[PDB]
Amino acid sequence: PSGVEGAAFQSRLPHDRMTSQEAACFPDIISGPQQTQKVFLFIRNRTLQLWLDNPKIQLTFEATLQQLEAPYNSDTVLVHRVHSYLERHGLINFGIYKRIKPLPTKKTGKVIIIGSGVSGLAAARQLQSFGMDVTLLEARDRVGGRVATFRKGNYVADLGAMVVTGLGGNPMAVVSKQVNMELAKIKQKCPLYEANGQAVPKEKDEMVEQEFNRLLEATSYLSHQLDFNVLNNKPVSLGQALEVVIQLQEKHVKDEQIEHWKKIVKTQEELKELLNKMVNLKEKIKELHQQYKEASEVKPPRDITAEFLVKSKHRDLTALCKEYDELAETQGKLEEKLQELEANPPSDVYLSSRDRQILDWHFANLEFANATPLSTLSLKHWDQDDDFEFTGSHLTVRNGYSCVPVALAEGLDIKLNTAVRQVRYTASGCEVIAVNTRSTSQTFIYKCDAVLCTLPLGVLKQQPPAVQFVPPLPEWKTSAVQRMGFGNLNKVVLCFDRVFWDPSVNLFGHVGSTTASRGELFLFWNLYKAPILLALVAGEAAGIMENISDDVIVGRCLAILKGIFGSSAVPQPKETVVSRWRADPWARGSYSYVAAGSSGNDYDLMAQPITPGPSIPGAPQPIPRLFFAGEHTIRNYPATVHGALLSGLREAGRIADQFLGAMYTL
Amino acid sequence: RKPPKGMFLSQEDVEAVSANATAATTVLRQLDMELVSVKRQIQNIKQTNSALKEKLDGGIEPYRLPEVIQKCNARWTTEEQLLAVQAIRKYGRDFQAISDVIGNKSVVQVKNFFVNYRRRFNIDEVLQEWEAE
C-alpha cells in the first residue's frame, strides 16, 4: 500500500474507517456527518505519513499544519485535536527523535516503572516525553530484559529476541530508521537432516511438509466446524486435536484396505461359485459324451428311435458345450478384475516411522513458535493473533538486538540492581519497596502517583510471590494470570573460528530420534557476520535441557553437527553460551502463549489497570494507580518485541490521559 | 464448510476415537484384526479355487464334436417327420432344440409342422405327455 493510505496501514490502522479508539476521543466526528469523518481520516493518515517519512525529528503541530493544505487545513482545532491524539498514544513522536522544542523543566506527576524491558523503556520515554517524572526500577544489571545480546570480542549473538517479523506495519520499522540496526533478511530455505546425518530428499521433505499443513487445517476444521473444543470437561488442546486427526487418518487408511480386499473376496467367491458350475458341467459333459459315443457305436441301419438317440444326445452335448464356453468367458471375466485389483492396492501406511519423525520436526517448529508443548496451546485460540501478521520478510539484527533497549534507555532514570519486593498502592498514591540485588539488606522506598508494572508474566505467576501486592491483586486479575500461558525455549550459542557450514543458507534443521526429543537442538541459525551458529531447544526439551550441564549440551550440538558436516570439519567452539530462561528469576520463561482454557480475552484483562479502594470510607471513587504493560498485555501482538513496545506506548498514553488530562476530547 | 481433501473427519468418527482414553488404540486394533481376518480368508478361497481350477485341466476339448454344416431343406421325409415327433416328446415347445435335432429344418418350419400335422401326429397328446415331467 502507498500514499496517505499506506501510512494508515503502516500504523496498523484502517485508512477508510475510524477505530474504536478514535470514536472514544472524537465521538462528535464519528457520530457526525460522513463528510467530516472523511475529513478526519485524511488528517489522521496525512499526519501519520509526515511522521513516518521522517521519524528522526519531532512532528510538531505547526510543522504539521504547514504541510496540510485546504480544505483540510481550514479547521485548526481539528488538526490540533488529531495531532494531539496521535502524539499521546504514540502513533507519532515515539521512539528516539530529536526534540524540536525542548521539554519543560518543571515536571508534573511521578511514575515508577517496574522493569526496563522494552515495554518499560517505551513507556518511560513516552512519559518523560510528556513532561512526567519517571524512574525505572530494574532487577538486572542491564536493560532490555528479554532482549539479551551476547558480546565478546567480535562475537555477537542474541540470547533473547533476534528476529523482526516483517516491516509491513511493524513499529520496529520506525525504530530501525531511528536506531542503526543492521537488518539482514532471513532466507527461508531450510534443509532438514535426519539423525543419521544426511539430507531428507526433496520428494520426502515436501510430502511431509504438506501433510503437516493439511494436518493444521484439519484441527481448524475440528475446532470451527465440528466444535470439538471440550472433552470430559477439560478444554481441548492443539496437541490433542492433532493426535485425533492423525488417528482418524490412520483409521481411514485401514478402512480403505478393508473395503479393498473385501472386493477381492467378493470376487474370489463369484469365481468359486463359477468353478463349481464349470466342474459339475464338465461331469455332465463327460457322461453325455460317453452316452453319445455308445449310441453312435450302434451300427446303422437303425430304427428311428435309435437314430433319434444319436441326434438328440448330439444336440444335448452341444447345448452343454456352448454353456461351458460362455462360462469360460466369465471365468476369464473375473480372473482379470482379480489381477487388476491385486496390482492396485491402496496405501500401505498412513505414515512410516521415518515420515512421523520428520513430521515431528515440523511440530518442534510450532513448539518453537509458541514456546510450549502443543499439548498446552488452546485449540480454539492459539492462532487468534494471525490476522495482525505483518507483511514482508523476516529479519535479524546483525549487530545484536540489545542495541535498541540501550538506545531507548538513553536519557532515562534507571536504577539497576534494584529488585522490587513489594508494591503498595493506596487511594492517595503508591510506594514501591525494592532491594539491592548484590546485598539484599540495602532497602529502598519509592513514593509515586502511579506504578507501571512490566513484570514478565512468569514473574507474576511465581508461587510463592517474588513481588507482593498491597493490597492483593483482585481475583479477576490473578485468575487471568493463572489461566494464561508462559512458556519456554532456549538457545545454544556456538562460537567458532572457521565458517564450516553453508554460508548461503541461514537456517537448517536436525530431525530427532523420538517424538519426545523433537525439540532438542532441532534447528540451527547462521545469522551473523562472524562464525556463529545458534541452536534451538523447543517444546518439552526446553524445560528438561535446563537441568543439564552446559558442556553436555555443547557436546550434543557438536555430535549433531559432526553427523551433518563430518567429524573432521567441525572444530571445538571458541565460546559457548546456553540460555536457561525458565531458570532466570527475572523472567521465569521466554514468552507467553494462549494456554488451553485461556483466550485472547485474558490478554485484555492483563492490561486493565487497578484502582485502589477509598482510604476514608464514603470518599469518592479514586483514580487508578497500578498499570500493566509488557508482552503478555497486548492481545493482538503477544509474545513479541513489537508487542511489548506497543503495550508500553499504550500505557504511557493512558497514564498521561489520567494524570495530565486529555484536552483533545472536547 | 468442508475439511481439506483426503482428510477424513466425520462427527461420528471423531466421537468414537475420544469416547475413552484408549478408544483410539481400540478401534485401530479392531481393523488390524478385521484385516487379518480377510487376508487369510482371501488366501483360503485362493486355494479352494486353485483346486477347482485344476479339476478342469484340459477344458472340454476331448469332448467336442465337429459341426454339421447342412444346407436347410423344405420337404419333410418320413424319417424327418418321425424324428420331429420324438423331439417334441422330449423337448416340448423349445423349437430351437428340435431344429438342431432334425438338422435340415429351420425353426419356422419346426414351429410350422406343429400345426400342419397337429391332428395327424396327435401333437396334443405328445405335448400333453411331455408336460408330465
From Swiss-Prot, chain A:
> Which cellular component, as a GO term, is one annotated location?
nucleus
GO BP: cellular response to cAMP; cellular response to gamma radiation; cellular response to UV; cerebral cortex development; DNA repair-dependent chromatin remodeling; epigenetic regulation of gene expression; guanine metabolic process; muscle cell development
Q: According to the lineage, what is the superkingdom?
A: Eukaryota
Induction (record text): Down-regulated during neural differentiation in neuroblastoma cancer.
Keywords of the record, alphabetical order, are:
Acetylation, Chromatin regulator, Chromosome, Coiled coil, Cushing syndrome, Developmental protein, Disease variant, FAD, Flavoprotein, Isopeptide bond, Nucleus, Oxidoreductase, Phosphoprotein, Repressor, Transcription, Transcription regulation, Ubl conjugation
Modified sites of kind Phosphoserine: 441
Which portions of this protein are annotated as coiled-coil regions? 258-344
Q: What is its EC number?
A: 1.14.99.66
Say where the cross-link Glycyl lysine isopeptide (Lys-Gly) (interchain with G-Cter in SUMO2) occurs: 272, 299
Q: In which tissues is it expressed?
A: Ubiquitously expressed.
Q: N6-acetyllysine modification sites?
A: 262-263, 266
Reported effect, residue 591 to A: Strongly reduces demethylase activity
Q: What is the effect of changing residue 365 to A?
A: Strongly reduces demethylase activity
Name the positions where FAD binds: 119, 138, 140, 146, 162-163, 631, 640-641
List required co-factors. Answer: FAD
Subcellular location, principal: nucleus
Domain SWIRM span(s) in chain numbering: 4-103
Q: Output the Gene Ontology terms for molecular function.
A: chromatin binding; DNA-binding transcription factor binding; enzyme binding; FAD-dependent H3K4me/H3K4me3 demethylase activity; flavin adenine dinucleotide binding; histone demethylase activity; histone H3K4 demethylase activity; histone H3K9 demethylase activity
Q: Mutating residue 491 to A: effect?
A: Abolishes histone demethylase activity
- Provide the cross-link position: Glycyl lysine isopeptide (Lys-Gly) (interchain with G-Cter in ubiquitin): 333
Q: What does this protein do?
A: Histone demethylase that can demethylate both 'Lys-4' (H3K4me) and 'Lys-9' (H3K9me) of histone H3, thereby acting as a coactivator or a corepressor, depending on the context. Acts by oxidizing the substrate by FAD to generate the corresponding imine that is subsequently hydrolyzed. Acts as a corepressor by mediating demethylation of H3K4me, a specific tag for epigenetic transcriptional activation. Demethylates both mono- (H3K4me1) and di-methylated (H3K4me2) H3K4me. May play a role in the repression of neuronal genes.
- Subunit composition? Component of a histone demethylase complex with RCOR1. Component of a RCOR/GFI/KDM1A/HDAC complex. Interacts directly with GFI1 and GFI1B. Interacts with INSM1 (via N-terminus). Component of a BHC histone deacetylase complex that contains HDAC1, HDAC2, HMG20B, KDM1A, RCOR1 and PHF21A. The BHC complex may also contain ZMYM2, ZNF217, ZMYM3, GSE1 and GTF2I. In the complex, RCOR1/CoREST strongly enhances the demethylase activity and protects it from the proteasome while PHF21A/BHC80 inhibits the demethylase activity. Interacts with the androgen receptor (AR).
UniProt record similarity statement = Belongs to the flavin monoamine oxidase family.
Q: What is known of its domains?
A: The SWIRM domain may act as an anchor site for a histone tail.
Q: What is this protein's record name?
A: Lysine-specific histone demethylase 1A
Q: What species was this sequence derived from?
A: Homo sapiens (Human)
Q: Taxonomic lineage of this organism?
A: Eukaryota, Metazoa, Chordata, Craniata, Vertebrata
Annotated gene: KDM1A
Full protein stretch here = 171 to 836 of 852
UniProtKB/Swiss-Prot annotation, chain B:
Q: Where is the SANT domain?
A: 71-122
Positions the record marks as coiled coil are 24-59
* PTM text: Phosphorylated by HSV-1 protein kinases in case of infection.
Tissue pattern of expression reads: Ubiquitously expressed.
Q: Which domain of life is it from?
A: Eukaryota
Q: Where is this region: Interaction with KDM1A?
A: 1-74
User: Where is it localised?
Assistant: Nucleus
This chain's function reads: Essential component of the BHC complex, a corepressor complex that represses transcription of neuron-specific genes in non-neuronal cells. The BHC complex is recruited at RE1/NRSE sites by REST and acts by deacetylating and demethylating specific sites on histones, thereby acting as a chromatin modifier. In the BHC complex, it serves as a molecular beacon for the recruitment of molecular machinery, including MeCP2 and SUV39H1, that imposes silencing across a chromosomal interval.
The record's similarity note reads:
Belongs to the CoREST family.
Oligomeric form and interacting partners: Interacts directly with GFI1 and GFI1B in a RCOR/GFI/KDM1A/HDAC complex. Interacts with INMS1. Component of a BHC histone deacetylase complex that contains HDAC1, HDAC2, HMG20B/BRAF35, KDM1A, RCOR1/CoREST and PHF21A/BHC80. The BHC complex may also contain ZMYM2, ZNF217, ZMYM3, GSE1 and GTF2I. Interacts with REST. Interacts with the SMARCE1/BAF57, suggesting that the BHC complex may recruit the ATP-dependent chromatin-remodeling SWI-SNF complex. Interacts with SOX2. (Microbial infection) Interacts with herpes virus HSV-1 ICP0 protein; the interaction leads to the disruption of the BHC complex, thereby preventing the BHC complex from repressing transcription of viral genes.
**Domain comment?**
The SANT domains may bridge the nucleosomal substrates and the demethylase KDM1A.
Identify this protein by name. Answer: REST corepressor 1
